């Protein structure tokens, strides 16, 4: 199972969603500002995108 998407740093949310859904059709994609604190529970189906002021992916997306 692919768990990380280093190739998406710098890319838009639209691009990131297209790629993650190709790779991971069940993905629940969540978009948060960089630095947002999340709760600890694990979801194998979730991929969070931490984005910058311009809605570009700012750090490597991972499952969880």
Numbering used by the authors: 1 to 64
Article passage:
CI2 is a small single domain protein of 64 residues, which has been extensively used as a model to understand key concepts of protein folding and stability. L49 and I57 are both part of the folding nucleus in CI2 and very important for the stability of the folded state of CI232. Here, we have applied an efficient in-cell assay in E. coli to select variants of the barley chymotrypsin inhibitor 2 with increased stability. We, therefore, determined the crystal structures of all four CI2 variants in the wild-type to L49I/I57V double mutant cycle.
Instead, the most abundant mutant after selection was I57V which can be made by a single base substitution from the Ala codon. As I57V is more stable than the wild-type this demonstrates the efficiency of the selection system. Relative to the wild-type, I57V is stabilized by ΔΔGf = −2.2 ± 0.1 kJ mol−1. Overall, the structures of L49I, I57V and L49I/I57V are highly similar to the structure of the wild-type with RMSDs for the backbone of 0.16, 0.45 and 0.17 Å. The larger RMSD for I57V is a result of the overhand loop in this structure adopting an alternative conformation compared to the other three structures. The Val at position 57 in I57V and L49I/I57V superimpose, except for the missing δ1 methyl group, with the Ile at position 57 in the wild-type and L49I. Analysis of the pairwise interaction energies at the residue level suggests that much of the stabilizing effect of the I57V mutation originates from an unfavourable interaction between I57 and Q59 that is observed in structures of both the wild-type and L49I.
